[model samples]
Each structure stands twice: as structure tokens, then as C-alpha cells.
Target: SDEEEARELIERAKEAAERAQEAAERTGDPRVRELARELKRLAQEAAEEVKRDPSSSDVNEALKLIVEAIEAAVDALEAAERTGDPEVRELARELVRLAVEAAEEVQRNPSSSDVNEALHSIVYAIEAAIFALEAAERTGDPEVRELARELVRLAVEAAEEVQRNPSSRNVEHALMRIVLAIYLAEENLRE
Candidate 1:
């Protein structure tokens, strides 16, 4: 049962990592770009090791580390967007739309194993938040910009929290929340 559980966990992690990578690619967030690459690399290594020794604790530990890295990357991206530049805000809006699209794709085809699609969707959403914050910041209105920055931090934190303890349920929840937040943030900016 332990081996099975381990295998399942690794598989789930692989899926999550794939999603994270997709998100990074969709948003073109530099922080997420590197994180996604690392997540993919680590996931591949974990998959290979698990195949060779399904019961290896090292594999489990590796998965945790990789997940942590994903969380950190998401956090960093959120922090970067806090600068509130207009360019960043526009980009963030696009990112949010992309993330929502990715989530919708996953909902449409729940059987899909390619986590990249899901990840891309989430990343796009986050990117939108980042850009929005940037736009708010550019307004020279400290109150508005500060609020946008807070929102970006919240969105990023939500994703990071999911990464910290990824499960099938949590991953799904996180993805949906990220997508919703992106949309809401964009709408708020429009208003």
C-alpha cells in the first residue's frame, strides 16, 4: 500500500508540475518560466526513479522539494508584479485570461493527462493579476496601486499554498481559485 500510495503521489505531483509549467509558458512570467522548467526536470527524474524503485523514499522527498520550488516560484512572480507598472498590468490581464482558458480546457477534458494545459491556464490568470497591479501602480494613486499589489500577493499566495501541499483535490481547487481570482482582478481593474 505504501508503494502504491507513493506511486500515486508521484503521479499526482507530475500532473501538478505539468500544470505549473503550462501556466508559466502561457503567462510568459520569467519567474514561472524557470520554475516550470525545474518542475518538469524534477518530475521526470522522480518518474524515472519511481519506475526503477517504486518504494524509494528519496522519490517522495524529491517530490516535496519540487513542489516547494513551485510554490516559491509562484510567490516570486507575485512579488515582482507588486511594482504596479502599466505594462505589467496589461500583461497580467492576458495572463489571467489564459489561465482561465486553461482551467476550462481541463474541465472539458478531465481525462487529459497532459498537465501542461491546466498549468498554462492558471499561469495566464496570474499574469493578468500582475499586469493589473502594474497598471494600478502607474496611475500615481498610491491607494489604488497598493490595493492592486495586495491582490496580486493574495493570488500568488493562493497558488503557492497549493504548491506547498498539492493533492488531486487541492490542485484542482487551487487551479480554479487562481482562475477566478485572475478574472475578478481584471474586472476590478476595468471598474
Candidate 2:
């Protein structure tokens, strides 16, 4: 009955991958789609190997791989939830509130116009950062602003995704990166 048990475990892994694939597609993130596809492939391979005159020792390896596949699928599904869940909306709102509070603290007597000016000026800062990428040859080789530029791109796409699907939690992730970048920049300024 080791074969029977092995088959059952493979079936479970396949089902887990199927669910992960569904969640991955719902998030519409290509990276997650690729990950889910890999999970499916892992289950398929493990099943194929287990079916070939399987022994108990072989089933043990199959079990190991199958468990790995299931755990990876669950992790992928959790990441999808973070990108597309109701609680994410509240988290994004909380980030905005914290950002506003930080701004107020920095500008103790801030007015509406001050907020407007800060908003307008940040676009130029972004532009300058992009320009710096072009100005520095080492930027092409990475290890610095290259990742930062990619993060900016991610934030832009996340913004578009949030607009396209208001129920999705892409905005929360975008806000997270933005706030983290600000915090890091402030820390760097301390030198």
C-alpha cells in the first residue's frame, strides 16, 4: 500500500499547486505565476517518479519533495493574499496616515500649500534620481540606484494595478516600498 499512499500524497501536492495557481493568476503577478507553475511541475515529477515501481524508500523521497512543493505553494498563496486582500486596504490607509503624520512633524506649521508644494517637488526629485542613473556609468553595472529604479518601476505598475482593480492590495505594497525608501534615505542623511 506504499504506492497507494504515495499516489495520495502526490494527489494532495497537485491539488495544492492547483489552488496556488488559481491564487497566483488572481494576483496577476507574473513572478507568482511562474512560481506556481514550478510548483505544478514539481508535483508532476514527484508523481511520475513515485509511480515507477515505487518502494517505501522511494516514497520517502517522494514525500520529502511533495511536502516541499506544498509548503512552497502555501507561501506563494500567502504572498498573493498580501497583494490582494481586504486587510491590505486598511494597511495601506494606515501607511498614508503615518506618512501624513511624519510630514506634519517635519513641517510643524504646515499649511495646505506646503503639502501641495511637497507633492510637486518630489516629482522633480524622482526625475533627478533618474537623471543620475543616466549620468553615472556605474549605475548600469548596478549595486546602487539600479535596484532603486526597479523599485520605482514596481511602484508605478502597482499604482496602475491598484487603479485597475480597486479591491486589490497592490497599493499597500507600493506604499510599503515608498515609506521604506524614505526611512532609509533619512537614515543615510544622518552621516
Candidate 3:
């Protein structure tokens, strides 16, 4: 039953990544497409990790891959606030609500499958923001900071993969610094 749950979670995460890509295609945003692709890339990467070496250490690494995606859902939430579309506003509200829930899932249990629920929700929230973009009119290309924000999502994903220790000082600071930068960039884009 635990294996069943794990597979189901992985599949949902995969579908969430696929929906993100399709949403990007429908709207034609490079960064959204990038987020879409990155989401898939990470999921597959982790899946491969599970297949290659299902060791506890490796599984831990695989689960950690989604940490960045979960953390950066707030970037999309904040970015959504600046959109002129009421639908976008609604999506933003939901995004904020769910991202927090997802974040708490991961925070509550790093060594468990809660990370899958969190990661899937994170990318789905990202999909919501990019999809909301289609409902809004823009003054220009989504700002540079917006693109960078998506990269922060990816960076956090990558960083977690290499993290040697969850509580290590270097890992904590690196994660904090990158996350703070993502927040600052979102704030700047709002200005």
C-alpha cells in the first residue's frame, strides 16, 4: 500500500508537470515554458534516482528535489497580485492558500511522501500563475525578475539535490539567500 501511494503520488506529480508545460504552450510564455520543462526535468530526474538507487539516502535526495519548487510558489503568488485580471486575482488567492499548505506539508515531514504532495501542489500553483497570465493583459513581456523568479524555483530544486545535510549551515544559508533573492526580485517586479 505504501508503494501504491508512492507511485500514485509520483504520477500526480508527473501530470502536474505535464499540465504546466501545456499551459505554457497555450499562453506562449518562454519562462512559463521553461518552468514547465524544468518541472518535468526535475520529476524525471528524481524518478530516475528512485529507479537507479532506492536507497534511503537517494530517496531522500529525490524527495528533496521538489523543495525549491515548493518554496518558490510564493513568487508566483506575489506576481499574480500585480495582474489586472480578476481571474488572476482569484488564482493568486488560491495559490497563496495552497502554497502555504504545500509548504507546511514538506516542512512537517521532510523524510516522507508529503514532499510529493507539496511539490505537486507547488508546480500546480506555478501552472495557476502562468495560466492566470493568459487571463491578464501585460504591459510588456513578463518582467526580467519574473523569469528570474522561475529560475529560483529551479535553483532551489537543484540546490536541494546536492544538499549534504538538511541542517547543515552551508545548505541552510544557501537556501535562505536564494529564497530571499527570489522574494526581493518579486518585490522589485511589483514596483
Clash totals for all models, in order?
Answer: 19, 0, 0
Cα displacement (angstroms), candidate 3, residue 117, comes to: 16
Full-model lDDT for every candidate: 0.49, 0.42, 0.46
In model 2, the Cα lDDT at residue 156 comes to 44
Q: Which is better, 1 or 3, measured by lDDT?
A: 1
lDDT for model 2, on a 0 to 1 scale?
0.42
Can you write out model 3's per-residue Cα lDDT over 1-191, one digit (the tens) per residue? 44554565466556655654554476444544544455455556545544454434434443544534533453464365456544434544444444444444554455665455444534543553453343233433344335434433443443344233333222334434544554454556579
Model 2 is weakest, by summed lDDT over 10 consecutive residues, at 93-102
Better of 2 and 3 by lDDT: 3
Clashing pairs in 2: none
Candidate 1 residue lDDT tens string, 23-103: 567665664565456545555655565577777664355344334334433443454445546544444433433333334
Q: How does model 3 fare in lDDT?
A: 0.46
